[PDB]
């Protein structure tokens, strides 16, 4: 019901159904808001299993996308108002929870925790780090292969000629841990990431440039129960 | 001189350009000019004997002389600021003022050879930038002063170089660490060169003045690396 009110409150035009594959990559499919009804929540929507890597094979393609109404959150990037709803992948009819669905697996693990009675909740506080570049090029064919990385912060650009001049204040190799701007070129961006993360339900504890030259950065978020944290990741 | 001339000109004729600079590149070998020496009288090799590695006690005094006046010899055998970019705490750096028939940490190697007719010493720290004449002369005069004053060498170093060791901080004899230091040594320790009226004070002072002017260019001109290290200070 909270979902049906969020649809009106934000004048939502679409609902973006999300899930994760075995490799860990978030996937999605979109339906007009008007396709969201009572049925939707109790029986979900049907989709082809055989399309995702490592899932159903030749014979048993069809499976169920079960919206988890607790996950509803507005997408801050899409042009038209759209609501994101994370889904679990259930076996049809049985509506059990696909053996290969990583979210189902994580839920099963939280269940088993409570079952053994060892504890009733698990707490995860992961600290993912990442890189921000300007140009990334790569390829591989019979005659060779390559990868080229480029960023305005890369130490290697200390010698690069730039259109409007090289302003040269860059983090040297392993020298990214905290020089204030302009050496650190990502303050504004790290904060937008923070604000947006919070608009999406995450709670931010800190943000800072990391060690590596060429844009290594980190946004630290507050822990949460295991499955909700993986969602947060 | 002829050697250099041939090298320079054959290179030119082949479309190349040769240099005898001691360290044109950081990160790879520099160019040295090891000097093998020995003395003789009426056809006999005054350096062969029953002492260490087949040496005469005369050879040892000679070595002692070279070691005593090493820093001053440096001003002639390593007459460029660049020379000291080769003579740096490295593994194979011929900077330890000692002798040995094996330890190639020692700036004085004793070639192990069969025929006593070929017994000699190898002073390793000289570089090709050195004035033939003045470098060789300074080496001799130091050797002679080592003899005239029976300057004993001490015992041969057969342990290791500059790094580990690092036990007793390994502060044993070493060659000059900069051109200025070498020039200053030459200034103070000039007696052994003036012996026999070979080198006059005027000559020595003039030489020092020529090199100080060179040393100044390098000391006064900002170095590219200084930008890497301090532009963002």
Swiss-Prot record, chain A:
Name of the protein described by the UniProt record: Glutamine synthetase
Record domain GS beta-grasp: where: 10-94
Residues spanning the signal sequence: none
Residues engaged in binding ATP: 205
Places the protein is found: Cytoplasm
Residues of the full protein shown: 4 to 236 of 469
Binding-site positions, Mg(2+) 1: 127
Subunit structure of this chain's protein: Oligomer of 12 subunits arranged in the form of two hexagons.
Residues annotated to bind Mg(2+) 2: 129, 210, 218
Entry's family note: Belongs to the glutamine synthetase family.
Function: Catalyzes the ATP-dependent biosynthesis of glutamine from glutamate and ammonia.
């Amino acid at each position: 019901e909270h979902v049906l009110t969020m649809l009106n409150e934000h004048e939502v035009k679409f609902v973006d159904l999300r899930f994760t594959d075995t490799k860990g990559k978030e996937q999605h499919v979109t339906i007009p808001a008007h396709q969201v009804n009572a049925e939707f929540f109790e029986e979900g929507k049907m989709f082809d299993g055989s399309s995702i890597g490592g899932w159903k094979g030749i014979n048993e393609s069809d499976m169920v996308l079960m919206p988890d109404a607790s996950t509803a959150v507005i997408d801050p990037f899409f042009a038209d108002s759209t609501l994101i709803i994370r889904c679990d992948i259930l076996e049809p009819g049985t509506l059990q929870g696909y053996d290969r669905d990583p979210r189902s697996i994580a839920k099963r693990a939280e269940d088993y925790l409570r079952a053994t009675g060892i504890a009733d909740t698990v707490l995860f506080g992961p600290e993912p780090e990442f890189f921000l570049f300007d140009d990334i090029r790569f390829g591989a064919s019979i005659s060779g292969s390559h990868v080229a990385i480029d960023d305005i912060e890369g130490a290697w650009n200390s010698s690069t000629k730039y259109e409007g001049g090289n302003k040269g204040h860059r983090p040297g190799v392993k020298g990214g841990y905290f020089p204030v701007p302009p050496v650190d070129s990502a303050q504004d961006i790290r904060s937008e990431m923070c604000l947006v993360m919070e608009q999406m339900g995450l709670v931010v504890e800190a943000h800072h440039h990391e060690v590596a030259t060429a844009g290594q950065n980190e946004v630290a978020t507050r822990f949460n129960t295991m499955t909700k944290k993986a969602d947060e990741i | 001189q002829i050697y250099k001339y041939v090298v320079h000109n054959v290179a030119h004729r082949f479309g190349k350009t040769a240099t005898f600079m001691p360290k044109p590149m950081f990160g790879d070998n520099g160019s040295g000019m090891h000097c093998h020496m020995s003395l003789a009288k009426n056809g006999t090799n005054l350096f062969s004997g029953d002492k260490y590695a087949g040496l005469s006690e005369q050879a040892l005094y000679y070595i002692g002389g070279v070691i005593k006046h090493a820093k001053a010899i440096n001003a002639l055998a390593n007459p460029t600021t660049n020379s000291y970019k080769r003579l740096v705490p490295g593994y194979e750096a011929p900077v330890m003022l000692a002798y040995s028939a094996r330890n190639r940490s020692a700036s004085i190697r004793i070639p192990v050879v069969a025929s006593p007719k070929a017994r000699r010493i190898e002073v390793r720290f000289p570089d090709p930038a050195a004035n033939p004449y003045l470098c060789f002369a300074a080496l001799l005069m130091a050797g002679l002063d080592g003899i005239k004053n029976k300057i004993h060498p001490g015992e041969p170093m057969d342990k290791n170089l500059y790094d580990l060791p690092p036990e007793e901080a390994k502060e044993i004899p070493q060659v000059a660490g900069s051109l200025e230091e070498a020039l200053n040594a030459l200034d103070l320790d000039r007696e052994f060169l003036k012996a026999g009226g070979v080198f006059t004070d005027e000559a020595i002072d003039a030489y020092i003045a020529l090199r100080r002017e060179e040393d100044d260019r390098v000391r006064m001109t900002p170095h590219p690396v200084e930008f890497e290290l301090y532009y963002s200070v």
